[PDB]
Every structure is written in structure tokens, then in C-alpha cells.
């Protein structure tokens, strides 16, 4: 591993094209960077250096565990436990609820001085900087990753997306394209969301779009090459991709309508 | 019980088990927790924080070590040691301790969750901070000085002053920080001092301050622990979920610890 510092990461982010004063949605891997002097704290500081005082950093802070136990599959739980879990699950707390599968950087980021987290109990985002409150305000149940969500806010704020040591499999912005596009064979289903109600949760059944993630690599690579101003490069030891979210999401809508046809 | 023989443990079950162990409502409580020891916690670390907040109540105070031992000189790193060439770079480029940003190391999921709770506050020592929540939180974390990082003018001293209790939740006397308060207070036979480098925050950089400190001796923790505990009036042993738990009065125990070291420690 290469010894990588706060200053080196910040300079490499500027070399990739991270706009001072811009809104930046970050999908980060800590272990891909090399050996980070100061670890996840050094990564967060370098990202704040890159965007500057007038910039904004946004990161997914998903808490997938706050979901019906019948859906659980990494460690599935006994069926006899399901009703106790449903009644006793603590409600989402933006300060207390940890992230799952988001990475050490977002988990370190969410608590930063000035960082604010959105209200969705499963798909919240944390933001820091000039437009942080706007990014996280009124995150609705209707389209958790679409209209009235922080993904829509990054779009309206003409932000960039940084894939830092991870690829299109972590590209949340494709979900914004999925909600906006009536592509052939688009499906819906009913989901259970635990909505906070004091010290308890109130399970609310809601309809939602069924996401499709199999073509993320083919769609990403095709949309990325057609996104004007995009860049590829190395930040530390990590392979990185930087792109304008607006142009890219609009191309993803065009890709889904032309190339998706579900069984 | 699941495939892995773990039993379902809930926030309400943990708070009641804590009340049954003897956790006092309105009291100051210093916690040393293991999440895996508890069983399968419904809501994980967040459910342990909430159950501990329920046990002490609104008038109570929770305190936990939030140590960030990586903020030390690279020459001392052993678990993951780094090339000697990197040491001057590491010394120059290490970010300063930030109470909001710096993660804990070796503290566990519960402390890591706790430190960010609404109303929790964290002390200023770059290696040995504590986080506190509740009625006397600000008092507990306020005076964190360099002279005795785990002694006079440290959150361990505030727990003592406020007549707090100590909870060892699924871990034992190897995690008992209160022993360090006794170590500073007692001139036991072979007590040593050494010099240590502490990175002090200086804006965006660290300033490496060499300071004198007491050398901690930890090999007798279990022997001293069992001896002081059995003589601590009103202590309790019990079960919190699946975890073996110990609850004791910090003032009486720390005082017994000082007497134990004077009588049984003789360092060469
Ligand atoms: C359907 C959808 O698309 S939405 C989901 C959106 N997802 C995201 O935004 C997540 C974006 N991030 C990713 O995708 C990533 O690839 C991840 C987090 C899932 C995987 O990345 P990893 O690098 O494997 O994990 P992470 O970033 O948590 O790093 C911790 C690892 O770094 C290492 N590490 C620890 N300290 C340091 C340091 N100073 N320097 C370098 N590495 C370190 C350790 O190897 C650690 O592993 P351990 O904690 O098991 O010992
Ligand atoms: C010199 C001195 O005396 S001062 C030092 C004082 N130290 C302290 O106060 C720390 C107090 N804690 C301890 O001593 C503990 O024994 C520790 C933290 C060192 C080890 O405890 P562990 O239970 O092994 O770890 P921790 O509490 O972080 O729990 C995480 C483990 O819980 C498990 N886990 C995760 N979710 C759940 C859940 N819902 N339910 C139950 N277990 C879970 C996983 O195994 C996890 O480990 P992973 O992150 O590898 O997946």
C-alpha cells in the first residue's frame, strides 16, 4: 500500500476535476485509497477541502436493517422472531441509527460538525456545506430515491457524482432515472416502511417502483462516455470516476427507454 | 434461539435486566460494553444505547470511554505496524483530534453509536476522550487535561466525584478504566514514569507535545478486580440479555484498588 494523506487526496480530487463551490455526491471505499494517514477522518477532511466552504458534500447513509424481518437475507433470522422484531424495532434516529453497507467514510461523515441527515428510515442521506439543509429537507416516503429525495436535490443543484474506489454497482443516481422513466416492463410492488411513532415504529405499507440493478455496468459505461466534461483518474491508489449528475441522469433515462425491456 | 445459539434480546428486556442488576435511576453510570455478548439485539447498538438511557433516566448520566489510540506516535504502533520511512510523514500529516469526527478504536459498537447520540458530548483529550449523556454530561467531559489523561482532571475523576457506578457489560476487569484513576492516586512500590508524545490540535495540524506520565501496569487487573469487587459494598453480578454483567460503586471500588496496589504491587 501507498501512504496517502489528507493533502494528497484533496490535490488528487482537484486533479480529477472536483469543482470548488460545487455540490458533490460521494460513493467512497476507504480500503481502495491505499493506506490513509488518519483513515476515514482524513478522507472526510480532504472531501471538505475539495468542495470548499461554499461547496456541499452529500453521501448515502442507508440503514437497510430498518425493514421487515421477512425480507432479511445476509444473516436471516428465525420466523418465530418476526413479530417480536416488528413490535420492538427502535425507530430511525438520524443521530443514533448506524449505516449498513455505506462504508467507513459515510459512517464517519454523518456525524461531522455541520453535517445533517435526511428523515427516510431506510434510505437517508447526510449532507454538509452551503446547500446541506436543502439537500436533506423533506425526504418523503413516496419516492425514497426519486422525487422529493436528496438525489433530486443533487440534480436541481447541478451537482457532480464521485465514484471513489467503487463502480456503477454503487451509483445511487440511477434510481432517480428509474422513477422518472416509464421504460418497457417497469414494475411496482408493495413494501413495508417502519415509520417512527415515539419510542415505537408504525409499519406503513406503501407502493414503490421495483429497482433493476443488473444493467448498471453496461448503462453506466455507455452514459458516462456521453456525459460531457466527465473524468476518470486515480485518487490515492483508488480508481475514480467524476461526472455531472444532470447530464448523466438524463442519458440514463434515454438508455433505460432504449435498452431496458423487462420479462 | 437462532442457528448460532443466540437469543432474541430487545431494548425493553435490556432496560429491565439493567434495572434488575441494580442500575440506579438518576445515577451516573460508566459503561464498558460488548454488543456480541448480549445475544442478538433487536436494533443492535442503537437498542443498547436506548436501554442504557432508559435505565438511568432523564436525571441520570451515561459515560463511556471513546479512546482514539491511533492518535499516537507511529513508532509505538504494534497491532498494524507501519514502515519506519512513513513516521516523519505520519507525524507531520496526521489530522488533529476532532470530537465529532475522530472514530474510537477498540471501544466497541455501543460506544461508537453512543458518542453520536442527540445530547451526547465528548471530552477533548486526543487519545483518551470519553463521551457523556444526561444530567451531568457537560461536567463529566469539561476539564480533560493532558497531565493525567486518566486521572485528576479527567472524566474518570468526575465519575468518582459524582459518586457514579460502573457497569462491565459482557466484558471483564481487562476493560476496567477506573483502575487507572487508582494508578495515578497511589505511590505503589515500583511505580514508574516515562515520556510520551501527544498530538495536540493546532488548527489544521497537530503539535507533538512530549509529556511525563505514569506507566500503567495491567497484568493484575483480574486479580485486583476480583479482590476489590468482593469487598465493594452493595455490588452485584447478574445477566443482561445473554451477557455476564458486573455493577459496582466506583468511589468504594477505586479506594479499595489504591489499598490493593500498596499491599500487592511490587514492580521490579
Ligand atoms: C443499489 C445502490 O446502488 S445504492 C448503495 C450506495 N452505496 C454507497 O454509497 C457505498 C459506496 N461505497 C462502496 O460501494 C464500497 O465499495 C463499500 C463500502 C461497500 C466497500 O468498501 P471497503 O473499502 O470494502 O469498505 P470501507 O470503505 O468500509 O473501508 C473499511 C476497510 O478499510 C480498511 N482500513 C481501515 N483503516 C484504514 C486506513 N487508514 N486506510 C486504508 N484502509 C483502512 C480496513 O481494511 C477496513 O476493513 P475492516 O473494517 O473489515 O477491517
Ligand atoms: C486499559 C483499559 O482498561 S481502557 C479500555 C476500556 N475498553 C472499553 O471500555 C471497551 C469495552 N468493550 C469491550 O471490552 C469489548 O469486550 C470489546 C469492544 C473490546 C469487544 O466486544 P465485541 O462484542 O467483540 O465487539 P462490539 O461490541 O464492537 O460488537 C460488534 C460485534 O457484534 C456483532 N453484532 C452486530 N450486530 C449485532 C446485533 N444486532 N446483535 C448482537 N451482535 C451484533 C458482530 O459480531 C460485531 O462484530 P463485527 O463488527 O466484526 O461484525
From Swiss-Prot, chain A:
Species lineage: Bacteria, Bacillati, Actinomycetota, Actinomycetes, Kitasatosporales
Annotated consequence of substituting residue 170 to A: Modest decrease in activity with CMP-5'-3APn as substrate
Pfam families: Antibiotic_NAT
EC id: 2.3.1.-
Effect recorded for residue 27 to A: Retains 1.5% of activity with CMP-5'-3APn as substrate
Designated name of the protein: CMP-5'-(N-hydroxy-3-aminopropyl)phosphonate acetyltransferase
Result after altering residue 169 to A: No change in activity with CMP-5'-3APn as substrate
Protein role: Acetyltransferase involved in the biosynthesis of the phosphonate antibiotic FR-900098, a potent antimalarial agent that acts as an inhibitor of 1-deoxy-D-xylulose 5-phosphate reductoisomerase (DXR), the first enzyme in the nonmevalonate pathway for isoprenoid biosynthesis. Catalyzes the N-acetylation of CMP-5'-(N-hydroxy-3-aminopropyl)phosphonate (CMP-5'-H3APn), leading to the formation of CMP-5'-(N-acetyl-N-hydroxy-3-aminopropyl)phosphonate (CMP-5'-FR-900098).
The encoding gene: frbF
InterPro entries recorded: Amioglycoside_AcTrfase, Antibiotic_NAT-like
Pathway recorded for this protein: Antibiotic biosynthesis
Effect of residue 172 to A/C: Loss of activity with CMP-5'-3APn as substrate
Catalytic activity: CMP-5'-(N-hydroxy-3-aminopropyl)phosphonate + acetyl-CoA = CMP-5'-(N-acetyl-N-hydroxy-3-aminopropyl)phosphonate + CoA
GO molecular function: aminoglycoside 3-N-acetyltransferase activity
Amino acid at each position: 500500500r501507498e501512504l496517502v494523506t489528507r493533502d494528497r487526496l484533496a490535490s488528487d480530487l482537484a486533479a480529477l476535476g472536483v469543482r470548488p463551490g460545487g455540490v458533490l455526491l460521494v460513493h467512497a471505499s476507504l480500503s481502495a485509497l491505499g493506506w490513509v494517514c488518519g483513515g476515514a477522518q482524513a478522507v472526510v477532511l480532504a472531501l471538505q477541502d475539495a468542495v470548499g466552504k461554499e461547496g456541499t458534500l452529500v453521501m448515502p447513509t442507508f440503514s437497510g436493517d430498518l425493514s421487515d424481518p421477512s425480507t432479511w437475507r445476509r444473516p436471516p433470522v428465525p420466523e418465530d422472531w418476526w413479530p417480536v422484531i416488528r413490535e420492538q424495532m427502535p425507530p430511525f434516529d438520524p443521530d443514533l441509527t448506524p449505516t449498513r453497507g455505506m462504508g467507513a467514510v459515510a459512517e464517519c461523515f454523518r456525524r461531522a460538525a455541520g453535517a445533517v441527515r435526511s428523515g427516510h428510515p431506510q434510505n437517508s442521506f447526510a449532507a454538509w456545506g452551503a446547500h446541506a439543509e436543502q439537500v436533506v429537507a423533506e425526504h418523503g416516503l413516496t419516492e425514497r430515491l426519486g422525487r422529493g429525495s436528496p438525489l433530486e436535490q443533487v440534480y436541481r443543484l447541478d451537482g457532480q457524482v464521485l465514484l471513489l474506489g467503487c463502480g456503477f454497482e454503487s451509483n445511487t443516481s440511477f434510481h432517480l432515472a428509474e422513477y422518472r422513466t416509464a421504460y418497457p416492463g417497469r414494475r411496482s410492488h408493495r413494501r413495508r416502511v417502519p415509520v417512527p411513532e415515539g419510542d415505537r415504529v408504525r409499519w406503513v405499507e406503501q407502493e414503490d417502483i421495483v429497482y433493476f440493478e443488473e444493467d448498471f455496468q453496461t448503462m453506466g459505461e455507455s452514459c458516462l462516455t456521453r456525459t460531457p466534461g466527465h473524468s476518470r483518474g486515480t485518487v490515492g491508489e483508488a480508481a475514480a470516476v467524476l461526472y455531472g449528475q444532470r447530464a448523466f441522469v438524463d442519458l440514463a433515462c434515454e438508455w433505460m427507454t432504449a435498452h431496458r425491456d423487462l420479462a
